[PDB]
Curated annotation (Swiss-Prot):
This is Glycine cleavage system transcriptional activator. The chain holds residues 1 to 92 of 305 of the full protein. Belongs to the LysR transcriptional regulatory family. It comes from Escherichia coli (strain K12). Residues 23-42 bind DNA. Signal peptide: none annotated. It is found in: Cytoplasm. It comes from the Bacteria. Regulatory protein for the glycine cleavage system operon (gcv). Mediates activation of gcv by glycine and repression by purines. GcvA is negatively autoregulated. Binds to three sites upstream of the gcv promoter. Residues 6-63 form the HTH lysR-type domain.
Length: 92
DNA sequence: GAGCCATTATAAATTGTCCGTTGAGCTTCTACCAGCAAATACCTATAATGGGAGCTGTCACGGATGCA
């Protein structure tokens, strides 16, 4: 069974969506456009089947459907960036 | 009312493709001395001096053939 992992892009914008509280401001930190955020939520939804946020006026709140899947994203990028540091540091 | 999340299109990116090289290691093909097996030559000095070798066991016409 081929292990269909989540896309390499939807995960990082998902962490900055909660911190920045705004989707437009979530794109300036990742030097991308705001339209790229909505492109990747659907592809990752194929595995989840749960909606990631609940709409609020001029605000972004947390829903339990996507909340379970927040807790298994923020540690992936932490260690891989650490991983980049280790080879780079030992190379020097 | 204006900000911000679903839609639509495209090409830049992006990752898995067709083509080649190569040191090395494994599987053939060849040959050639060793060496033993095999093959081939040569010599033997008491004396020895003419077989048939089993016939063939018989039909029996014709047409020549060669003599006398």
């Amino acid at each position: 069974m081929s292990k269909r992992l989540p896309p390499l892009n939807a995960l990082r914008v998902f962490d900055a969506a909660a911190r920045h509280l705004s989707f437009t401001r979530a794109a300036e930190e990742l030097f991308v456009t705001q339209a790229a955020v909505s492109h990747q939520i659907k592809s990752l939804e194929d595995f989840l089947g749960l909606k990631l946020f609940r709409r609020r006026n001029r605000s972004l709140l947390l829903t339990e459907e996507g909340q379970s899947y927040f807790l298994d994203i923020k540690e992936i990028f932490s260690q891989l960036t650490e991983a980049t540091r280790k080879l780079q540091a030992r190379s020097a």
